[PDB]
PDB file of C-alpha atoms in Angstrom:
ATOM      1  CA  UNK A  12     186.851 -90.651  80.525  1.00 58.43           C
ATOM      2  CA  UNK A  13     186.026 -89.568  83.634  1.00 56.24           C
ATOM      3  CA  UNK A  14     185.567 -91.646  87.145  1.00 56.58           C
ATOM      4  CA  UNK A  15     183.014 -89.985  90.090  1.00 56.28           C
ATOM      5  CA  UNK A  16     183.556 -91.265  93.552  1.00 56.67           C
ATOM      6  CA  UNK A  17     180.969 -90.768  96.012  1.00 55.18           C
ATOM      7  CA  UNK A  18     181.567 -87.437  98.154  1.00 52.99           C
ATOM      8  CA  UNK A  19     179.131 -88.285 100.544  1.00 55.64           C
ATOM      9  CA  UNK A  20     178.582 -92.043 101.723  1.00 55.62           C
ATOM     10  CA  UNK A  21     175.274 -92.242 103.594  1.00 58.35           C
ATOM     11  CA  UNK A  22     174.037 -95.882 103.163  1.00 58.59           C
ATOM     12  CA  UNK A  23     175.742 -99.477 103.057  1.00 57.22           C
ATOM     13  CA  UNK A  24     175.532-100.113  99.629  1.00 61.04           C
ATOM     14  CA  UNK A  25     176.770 -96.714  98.554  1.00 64.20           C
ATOM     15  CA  UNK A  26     179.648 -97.979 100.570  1.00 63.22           C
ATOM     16  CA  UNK A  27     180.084-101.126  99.726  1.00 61.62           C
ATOM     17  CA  UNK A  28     180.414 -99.638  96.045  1.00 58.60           C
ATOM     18  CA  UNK A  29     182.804 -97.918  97.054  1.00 56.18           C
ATOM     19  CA  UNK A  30     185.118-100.335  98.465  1.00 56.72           C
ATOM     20  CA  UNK A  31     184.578-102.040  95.113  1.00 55.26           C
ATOM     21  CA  UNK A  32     185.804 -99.347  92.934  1.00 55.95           C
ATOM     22  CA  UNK A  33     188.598 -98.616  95.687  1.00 51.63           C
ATOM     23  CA  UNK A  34     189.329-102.444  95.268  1.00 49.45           C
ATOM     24  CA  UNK A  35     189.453-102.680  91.773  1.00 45.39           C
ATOM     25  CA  UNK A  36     191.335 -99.220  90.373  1.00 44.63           C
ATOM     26  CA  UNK A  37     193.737 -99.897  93.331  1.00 43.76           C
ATOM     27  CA  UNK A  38     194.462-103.660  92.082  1.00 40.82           C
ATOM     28  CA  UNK A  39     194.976-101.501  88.043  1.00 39.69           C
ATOM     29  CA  UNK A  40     196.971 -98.730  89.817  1.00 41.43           C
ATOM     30  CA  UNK A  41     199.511-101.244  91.366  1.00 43.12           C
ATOM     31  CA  UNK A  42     199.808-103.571  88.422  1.00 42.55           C
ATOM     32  CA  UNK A  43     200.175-100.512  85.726  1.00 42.44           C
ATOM     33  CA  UNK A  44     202.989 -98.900  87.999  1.00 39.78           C
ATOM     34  CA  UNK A  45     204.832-102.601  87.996  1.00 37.69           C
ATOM     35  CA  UNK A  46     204.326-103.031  85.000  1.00 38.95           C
ATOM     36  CA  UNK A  47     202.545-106.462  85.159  1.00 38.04           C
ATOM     37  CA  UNK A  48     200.495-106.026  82.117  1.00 36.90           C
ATOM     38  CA  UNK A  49     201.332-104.105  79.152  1.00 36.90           C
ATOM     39  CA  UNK A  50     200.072 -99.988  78.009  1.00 32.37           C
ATOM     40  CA  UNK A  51     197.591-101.791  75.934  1.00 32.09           C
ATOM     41  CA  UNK A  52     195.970-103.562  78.499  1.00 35.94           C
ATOM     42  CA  UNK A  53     194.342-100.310  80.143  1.00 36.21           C
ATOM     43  CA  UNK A  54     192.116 -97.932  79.416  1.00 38.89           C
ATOM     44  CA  UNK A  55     192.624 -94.062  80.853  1.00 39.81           C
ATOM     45  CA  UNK A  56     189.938 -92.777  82.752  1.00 42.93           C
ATOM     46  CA  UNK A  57     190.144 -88.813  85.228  1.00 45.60           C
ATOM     47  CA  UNK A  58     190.249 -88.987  88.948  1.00 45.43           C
ATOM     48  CA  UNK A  59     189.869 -84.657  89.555  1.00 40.19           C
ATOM     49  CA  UNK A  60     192.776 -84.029  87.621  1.00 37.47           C
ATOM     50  CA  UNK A  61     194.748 -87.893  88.616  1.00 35.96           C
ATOM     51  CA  UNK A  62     195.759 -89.781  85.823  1.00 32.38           C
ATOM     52  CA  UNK A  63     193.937 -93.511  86.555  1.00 29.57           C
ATOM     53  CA  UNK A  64     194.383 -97.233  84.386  1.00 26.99           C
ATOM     54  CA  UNK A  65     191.639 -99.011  84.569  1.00 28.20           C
ATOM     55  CA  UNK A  66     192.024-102.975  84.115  1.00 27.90           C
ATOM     56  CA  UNK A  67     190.961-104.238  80.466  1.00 28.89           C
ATOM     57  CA  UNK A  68     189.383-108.004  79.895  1.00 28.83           C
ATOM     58  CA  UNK A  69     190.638-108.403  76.582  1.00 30.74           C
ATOM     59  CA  UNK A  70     192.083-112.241  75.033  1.00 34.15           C
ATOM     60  CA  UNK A  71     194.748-110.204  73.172  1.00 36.18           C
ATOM     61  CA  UNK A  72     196.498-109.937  76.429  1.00 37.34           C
ATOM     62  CA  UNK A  73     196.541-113.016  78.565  1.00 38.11           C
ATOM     63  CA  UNK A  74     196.514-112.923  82.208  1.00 42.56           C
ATOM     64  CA  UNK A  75     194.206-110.055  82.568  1.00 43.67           C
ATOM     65  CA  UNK A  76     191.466-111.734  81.858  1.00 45.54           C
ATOM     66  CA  UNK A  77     192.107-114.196  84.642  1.00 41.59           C
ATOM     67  CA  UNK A  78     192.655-111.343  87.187  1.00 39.18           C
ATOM     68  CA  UNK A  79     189.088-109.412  86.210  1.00 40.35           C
ATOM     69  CA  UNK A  80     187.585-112.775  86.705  1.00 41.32           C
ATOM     70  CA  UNK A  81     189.326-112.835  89.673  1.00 39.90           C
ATOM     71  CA  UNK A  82     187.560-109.842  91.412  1.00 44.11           C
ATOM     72  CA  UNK A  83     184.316-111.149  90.788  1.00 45.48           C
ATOM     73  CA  UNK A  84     185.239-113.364  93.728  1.00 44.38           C
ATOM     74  CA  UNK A  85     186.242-110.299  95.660  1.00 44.00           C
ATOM     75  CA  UNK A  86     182.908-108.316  95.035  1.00 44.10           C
ATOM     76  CA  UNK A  87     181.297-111.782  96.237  1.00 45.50           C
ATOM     77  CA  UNK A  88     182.457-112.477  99.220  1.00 42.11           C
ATOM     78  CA  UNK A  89     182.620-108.222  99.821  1.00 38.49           C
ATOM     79  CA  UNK A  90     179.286-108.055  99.060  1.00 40.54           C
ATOM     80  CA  UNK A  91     178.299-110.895 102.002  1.00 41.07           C
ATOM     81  CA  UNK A  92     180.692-109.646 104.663  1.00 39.71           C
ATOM     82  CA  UNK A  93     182.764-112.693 104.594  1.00 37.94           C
ATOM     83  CA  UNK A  94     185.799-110.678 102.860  1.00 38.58           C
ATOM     84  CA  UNK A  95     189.078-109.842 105.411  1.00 39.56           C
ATOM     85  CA  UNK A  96     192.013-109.816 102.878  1.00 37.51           C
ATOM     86  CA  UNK A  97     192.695-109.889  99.202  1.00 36.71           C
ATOM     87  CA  UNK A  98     196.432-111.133  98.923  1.00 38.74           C
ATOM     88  CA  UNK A  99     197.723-110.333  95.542  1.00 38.27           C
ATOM     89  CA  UNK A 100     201.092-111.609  94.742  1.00 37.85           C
ATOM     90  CA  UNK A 101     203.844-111.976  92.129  1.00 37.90           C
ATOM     91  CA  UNK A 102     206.114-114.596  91.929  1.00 35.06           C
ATOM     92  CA  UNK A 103     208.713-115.672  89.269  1.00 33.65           C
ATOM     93  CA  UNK A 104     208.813-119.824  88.628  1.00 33.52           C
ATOM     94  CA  UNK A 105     205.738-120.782  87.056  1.00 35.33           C
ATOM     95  CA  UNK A 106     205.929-123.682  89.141  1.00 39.11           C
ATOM     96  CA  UNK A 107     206.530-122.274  92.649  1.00 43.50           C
ATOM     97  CA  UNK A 108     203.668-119.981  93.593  1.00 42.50           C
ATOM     98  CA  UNK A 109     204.678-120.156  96.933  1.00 43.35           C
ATOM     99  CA  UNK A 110     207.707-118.335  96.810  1.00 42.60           C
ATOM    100  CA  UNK A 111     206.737-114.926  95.911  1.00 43.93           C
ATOM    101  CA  UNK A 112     208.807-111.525  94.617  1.00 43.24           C
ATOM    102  CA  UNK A 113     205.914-108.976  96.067  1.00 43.60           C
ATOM    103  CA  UNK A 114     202.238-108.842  97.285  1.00 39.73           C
ATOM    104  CA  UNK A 115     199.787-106.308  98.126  1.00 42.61           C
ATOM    105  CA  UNK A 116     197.826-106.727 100.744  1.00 44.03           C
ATOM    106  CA  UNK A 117     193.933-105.290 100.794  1.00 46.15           C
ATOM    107  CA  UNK A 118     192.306-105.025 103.810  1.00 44.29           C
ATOM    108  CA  UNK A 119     188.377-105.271 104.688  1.00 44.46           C
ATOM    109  CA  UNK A 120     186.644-104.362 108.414  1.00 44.60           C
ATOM    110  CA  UNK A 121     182.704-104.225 108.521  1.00 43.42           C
ATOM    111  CA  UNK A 122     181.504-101.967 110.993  1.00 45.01           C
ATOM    112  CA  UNK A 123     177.970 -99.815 111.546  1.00 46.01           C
ATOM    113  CA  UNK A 124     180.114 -97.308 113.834  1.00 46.26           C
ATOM    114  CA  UNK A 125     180.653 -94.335 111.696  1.00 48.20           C
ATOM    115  CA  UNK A 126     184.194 -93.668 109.778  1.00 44.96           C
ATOM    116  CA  UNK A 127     187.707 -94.428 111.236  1.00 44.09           C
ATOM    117  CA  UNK A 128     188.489 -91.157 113.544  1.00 42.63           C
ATOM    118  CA  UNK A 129     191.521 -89.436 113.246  1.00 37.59           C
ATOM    119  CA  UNK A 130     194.187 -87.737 114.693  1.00 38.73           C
ATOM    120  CA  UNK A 145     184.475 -86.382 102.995  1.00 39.46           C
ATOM    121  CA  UNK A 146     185.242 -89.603 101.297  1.00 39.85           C
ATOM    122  CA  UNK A 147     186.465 -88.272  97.908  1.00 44.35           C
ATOM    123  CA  UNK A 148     189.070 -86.622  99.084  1.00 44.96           C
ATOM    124  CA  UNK A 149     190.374 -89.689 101.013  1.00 40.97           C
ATOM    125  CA  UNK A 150     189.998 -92.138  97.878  1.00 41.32           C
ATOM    126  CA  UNK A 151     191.837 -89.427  95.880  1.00 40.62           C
ATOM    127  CA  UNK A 152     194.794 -89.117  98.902  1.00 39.56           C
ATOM    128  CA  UNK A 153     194.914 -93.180  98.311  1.00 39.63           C
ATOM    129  CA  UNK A 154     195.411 -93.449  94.921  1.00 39.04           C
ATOM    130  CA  UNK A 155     197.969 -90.054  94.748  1.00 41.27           C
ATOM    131  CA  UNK A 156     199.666 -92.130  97.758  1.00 43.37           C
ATOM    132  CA  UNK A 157     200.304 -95.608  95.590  1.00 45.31           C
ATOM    133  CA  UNK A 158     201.614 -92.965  92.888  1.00 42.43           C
ATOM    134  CA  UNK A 159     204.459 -91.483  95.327  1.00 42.10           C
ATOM    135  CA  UNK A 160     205.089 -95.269  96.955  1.00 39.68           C
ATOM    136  CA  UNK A 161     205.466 -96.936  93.935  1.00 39.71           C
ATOM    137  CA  UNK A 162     206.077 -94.848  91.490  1.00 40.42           C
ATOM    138  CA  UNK A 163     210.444 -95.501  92.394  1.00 42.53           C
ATOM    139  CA  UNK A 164     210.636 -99.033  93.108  1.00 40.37           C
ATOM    140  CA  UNK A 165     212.502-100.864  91.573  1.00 40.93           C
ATOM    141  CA  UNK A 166     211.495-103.590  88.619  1.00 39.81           C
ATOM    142  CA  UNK A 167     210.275-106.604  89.430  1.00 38.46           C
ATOM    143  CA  UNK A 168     211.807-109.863  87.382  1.00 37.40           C
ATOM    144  CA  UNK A 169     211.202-109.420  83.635  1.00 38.49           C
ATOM    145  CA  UNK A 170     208.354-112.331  83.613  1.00 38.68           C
ATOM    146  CA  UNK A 171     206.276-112.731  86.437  1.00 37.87           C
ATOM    147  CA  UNK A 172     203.347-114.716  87.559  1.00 39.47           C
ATOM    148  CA  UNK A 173     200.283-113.514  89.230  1.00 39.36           C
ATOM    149  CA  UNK A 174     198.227-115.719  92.227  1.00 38.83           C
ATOM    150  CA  UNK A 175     195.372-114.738  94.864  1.00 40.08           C
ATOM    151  CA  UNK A 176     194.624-115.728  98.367  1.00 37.23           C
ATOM    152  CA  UNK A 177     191.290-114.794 100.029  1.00 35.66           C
ATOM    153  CA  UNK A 178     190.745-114.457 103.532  1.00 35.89           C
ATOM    154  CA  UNK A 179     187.597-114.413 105.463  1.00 39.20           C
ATOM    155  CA  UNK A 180     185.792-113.518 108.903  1.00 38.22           C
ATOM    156  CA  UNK A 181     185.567-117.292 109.518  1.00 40.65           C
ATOM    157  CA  UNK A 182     182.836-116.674 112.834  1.00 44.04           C
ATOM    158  CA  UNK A 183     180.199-115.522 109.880  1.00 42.14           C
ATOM    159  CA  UNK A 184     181.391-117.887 106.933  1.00 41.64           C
ATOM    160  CA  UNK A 185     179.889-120.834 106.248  1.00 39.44           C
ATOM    161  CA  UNK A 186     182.997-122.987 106.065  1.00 35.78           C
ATOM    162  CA  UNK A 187     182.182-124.550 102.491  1.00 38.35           C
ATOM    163  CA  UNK A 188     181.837-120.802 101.242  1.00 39.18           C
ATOM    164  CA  UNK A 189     183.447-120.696  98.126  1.00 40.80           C
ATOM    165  CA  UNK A 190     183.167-117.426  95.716  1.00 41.11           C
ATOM    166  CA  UNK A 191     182.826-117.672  92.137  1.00 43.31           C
ATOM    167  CA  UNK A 192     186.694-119.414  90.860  1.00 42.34           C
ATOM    168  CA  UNK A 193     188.295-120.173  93.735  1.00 43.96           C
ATOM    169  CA  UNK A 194     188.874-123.759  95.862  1.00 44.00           C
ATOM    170  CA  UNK A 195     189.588-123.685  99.346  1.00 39.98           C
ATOM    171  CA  UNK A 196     193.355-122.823  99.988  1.00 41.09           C
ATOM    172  CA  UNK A 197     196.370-124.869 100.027  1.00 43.33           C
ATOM    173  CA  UNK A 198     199.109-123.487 102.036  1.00 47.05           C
ATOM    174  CA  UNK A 199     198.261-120.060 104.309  1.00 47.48           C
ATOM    175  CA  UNK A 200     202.167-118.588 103.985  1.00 47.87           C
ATOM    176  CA  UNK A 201     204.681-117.759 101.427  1.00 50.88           C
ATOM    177  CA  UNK A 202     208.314-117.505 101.081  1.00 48.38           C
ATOM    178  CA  UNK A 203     209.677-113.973 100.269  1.00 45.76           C
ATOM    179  CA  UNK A 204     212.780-113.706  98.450  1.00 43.11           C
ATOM    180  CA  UNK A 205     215.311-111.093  99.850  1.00 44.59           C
ATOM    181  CA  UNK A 206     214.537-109.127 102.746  1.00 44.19           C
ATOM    182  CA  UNK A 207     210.912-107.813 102.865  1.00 49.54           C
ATOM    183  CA  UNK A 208     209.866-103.927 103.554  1.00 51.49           C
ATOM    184  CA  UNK A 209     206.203-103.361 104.756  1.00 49.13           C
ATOM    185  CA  UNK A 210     205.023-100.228 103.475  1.00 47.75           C
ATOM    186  CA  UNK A 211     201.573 -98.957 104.874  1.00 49.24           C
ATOM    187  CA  UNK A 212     200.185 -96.754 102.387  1.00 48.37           C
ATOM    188  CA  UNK A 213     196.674 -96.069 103.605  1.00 47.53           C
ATOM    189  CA  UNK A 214     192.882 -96.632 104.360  1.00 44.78           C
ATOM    190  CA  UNK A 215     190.021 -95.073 103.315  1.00 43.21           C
ATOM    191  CA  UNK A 216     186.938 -95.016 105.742  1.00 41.47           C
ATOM    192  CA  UNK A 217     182.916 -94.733 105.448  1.00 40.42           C
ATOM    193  CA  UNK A 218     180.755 -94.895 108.149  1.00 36.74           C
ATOM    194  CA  UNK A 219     180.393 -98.868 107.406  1.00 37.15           C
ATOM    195  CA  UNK A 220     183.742-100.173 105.885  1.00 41.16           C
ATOM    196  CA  UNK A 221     187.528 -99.523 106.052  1.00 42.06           C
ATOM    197  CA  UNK A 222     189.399-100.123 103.373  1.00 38.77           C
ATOM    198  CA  UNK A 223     193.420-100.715 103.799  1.00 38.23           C
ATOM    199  CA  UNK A 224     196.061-101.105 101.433  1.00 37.59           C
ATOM    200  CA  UNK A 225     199.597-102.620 102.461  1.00 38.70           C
ATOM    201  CA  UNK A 226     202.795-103.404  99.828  1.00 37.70           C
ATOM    202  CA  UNK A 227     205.533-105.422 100.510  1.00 31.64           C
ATOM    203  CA  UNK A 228     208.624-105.483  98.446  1.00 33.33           C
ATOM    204  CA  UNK A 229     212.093-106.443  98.719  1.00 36.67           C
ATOM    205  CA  UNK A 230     214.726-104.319 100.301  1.00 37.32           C
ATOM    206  CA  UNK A 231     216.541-103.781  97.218  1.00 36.20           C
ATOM    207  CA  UNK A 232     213.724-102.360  95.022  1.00 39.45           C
ATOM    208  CA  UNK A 233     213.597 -99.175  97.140  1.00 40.35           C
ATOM    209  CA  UNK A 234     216.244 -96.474  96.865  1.00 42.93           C
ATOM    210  CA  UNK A 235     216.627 -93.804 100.101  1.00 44.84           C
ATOM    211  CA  UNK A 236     216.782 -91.293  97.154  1.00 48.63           C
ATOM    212  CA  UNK A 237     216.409 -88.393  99.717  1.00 46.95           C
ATOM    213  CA  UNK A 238     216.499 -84.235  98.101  1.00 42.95           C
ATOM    214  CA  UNK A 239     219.081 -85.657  95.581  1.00 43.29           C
ATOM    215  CA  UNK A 240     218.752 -85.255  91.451  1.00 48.00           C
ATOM    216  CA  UNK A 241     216.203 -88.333  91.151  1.00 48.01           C
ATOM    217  CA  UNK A 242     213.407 -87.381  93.347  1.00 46.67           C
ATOM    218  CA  UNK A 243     214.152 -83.677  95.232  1.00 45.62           C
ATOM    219  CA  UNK A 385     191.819-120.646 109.466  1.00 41.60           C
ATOM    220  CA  UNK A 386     189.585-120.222 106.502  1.00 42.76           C
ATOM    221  CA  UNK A 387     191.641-119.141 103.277  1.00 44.91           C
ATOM    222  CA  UNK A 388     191.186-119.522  99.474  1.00 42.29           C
ATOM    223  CA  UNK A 389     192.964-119.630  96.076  1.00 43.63           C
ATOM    224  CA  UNK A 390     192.078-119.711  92.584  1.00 48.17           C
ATOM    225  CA  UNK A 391     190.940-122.906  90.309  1.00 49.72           C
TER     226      UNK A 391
END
């Protein structure tokens, strides 16, 4: 019940594992606070005193097992350096997946130049996290039923261009419409001395609230087969 990050990051697969579990508790966070998938599709696991959801691949609830599956594709193409973005986005007619009600936006850069300077890597991954708490903790609901699609992106000067990772085709169309008026809210990285990790939410103007000290709160691209 209990899930150890790193504190000290010292070689590139330490840090690549890292970015994985960053990846993937990030991808639970978000969908557990939107309520995407229901209470019973997480387990509970301890963060130094944070409250995390992990993910569950389970057939009694559908959908998550096509989003688990879904990350193996991210570790993949993580793993080989091709990864720049994981697009994850919600959208409302089954048939429309281009039109879209919110995405999150992850963010990969490869480097051998030490971590991002500013002006440990536990504490950082636990500032993340505690920051997609406070960002999305007030938004407002999403549509009652939603639909969830991915869209890959990929350092296309090191990617062979018939890459493909593990369930996904090569993309059909780069852009989506967003319904309403979209807010970009930049809610952090997390750095090692050989990846950054970035995470990026946009949702619609109406879902946040200005609730100030009041009462309430004082090109290569893919998709999935």
């Amino acid at each position: 019940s209990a899930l150890v990050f790193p504190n000290k990051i010292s070689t590139e697969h330490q840090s690549l594992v890292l970015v994985k579990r960053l990846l993937a508790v990030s991808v639970s966070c978000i969908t557990y606070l939107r309520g995407i998938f229901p209470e019973c599709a997480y387990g509970t696991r301890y963060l130094d005193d944070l409250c995390v959801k992990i993910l569950r691949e389970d057939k009694n609830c559908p959908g998550s097992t096509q989003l688990v599956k879904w990350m193996l594709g991210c570790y993949d193409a993580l793993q080989k350096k091709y990864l720049r973005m994981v697009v994850l986005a919600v959208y409302t007619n089954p048939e429309d997946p281009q039109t879209i009600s919110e995405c999150y936006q992850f963010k990969f850069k490869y480097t051998n130049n030490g971590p991002l300077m500013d002006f440990d890597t536990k504490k950082a991954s636990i500032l993340l996290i505690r920051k997609i708490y406070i960002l999305m903790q007030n938004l407002g609901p999403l549509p009652n039923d939603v639909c969830l699609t991915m869209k890959l992106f990929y350092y296309d000067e090191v990617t062979p261009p018939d890459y493909q990772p593990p369930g996904f085709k090569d993309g059909d169309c780069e852009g989506v419409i967003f319904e309403g008026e979209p807010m970009y809210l930049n809610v952090g990285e997390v750095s090692t001395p050989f990846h950054i990790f970035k995470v990026k939410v946009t949702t619609e103007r109406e879902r946040m609230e200005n609730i100030d000290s009041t009462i309430l709160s004082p090109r290569k691209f893919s998709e999935p087969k």
